[PDB]
């Protein structure tokens with residue numbers, strides 16, 4: 001009855017999530033854990049990187065620019081998903097924009113974990129795999145950035161969350177009343193309240209053996225916030241260090257605050 005409505009909401013969010021994101025954790029996992037057709041080309045070095053373009057400025061700049069484009073693309077996909085969450089589109093427009101700008105990076109860092117393994121990260125829609133060591137190898141400050149996302153992913157991946165779990169979790173992240181500058185907090189919190197209940201039910205049904213997964217997943221939010229803070233502090237270095245490097249408008253607007 002009450003639980004049925006929550007199950008329906010969970011089903012809804014899963015459906016929109018599959019439609020919203022071309023690459024899912026199930027696809028990512030099947031490519032990473034091996035499948036002769038799904039196997040990715042691996043870039044661990046400059047020669048492999050050079051080879052990679054044929055199969056799929058500066059090496060550090062070109063790679064960093066590739067990420068930028070990817071992040072812009074993710075923002076667009078996350079923005080469609082946000083539109084799907086019941087009640088989100090009904091909120092004041094300014095708030096929707098505010099939720100989107102604060103929410104989107106946390107979601108992005110969360111989704112990236114599904115592509116990550118301790119050794120590496122999937123690229124080009126799973127077509128390629130880029131090694132963690134190579135990314136670290138890159139000259140400062142570009143090389144440094146990845147290290148926090150890998151550390152998060154290995155821990156976050158330990159939860160063994162399903163794609164349906166993730167979808168509900170990403171909705172909870174987007175619908176956060178705390179965000180700075182929100183005109184109305186109450187309509188947002190009610191939706192979040194509904195979503196948190198759906199997550200709780202989903203986690204217990206989906207991982208009945210797993211104990212206090214809900215609380216552990218909620219605690220995970222702190223690590224996302226920290227990741228974002230480091231990233232922003234790093235973006236500031238890049239702008240000074242390279243006057244020639246250019247940041248995408250969509251990305252720039254969200255960062256500015």
Ligand SMILES: *[C@H](/C=C/CC(=O)CCCCC(=O)O)C/C=C\C/C=C\C/C=C\C/C=C\CC
Nearest residue numbers: 066067068070071108112122123124125126251
């Ligand atoms: C890019 C690393 C990006 C850093 C990040 O996690 C998001 C924040 C940076 C952008 C910003 O918000 O300012 C490397 C990771 C993935 C992309 C790598 C190469 C590009 C090719 C494909 C994109 C990867 C997956 C999509 C299929």
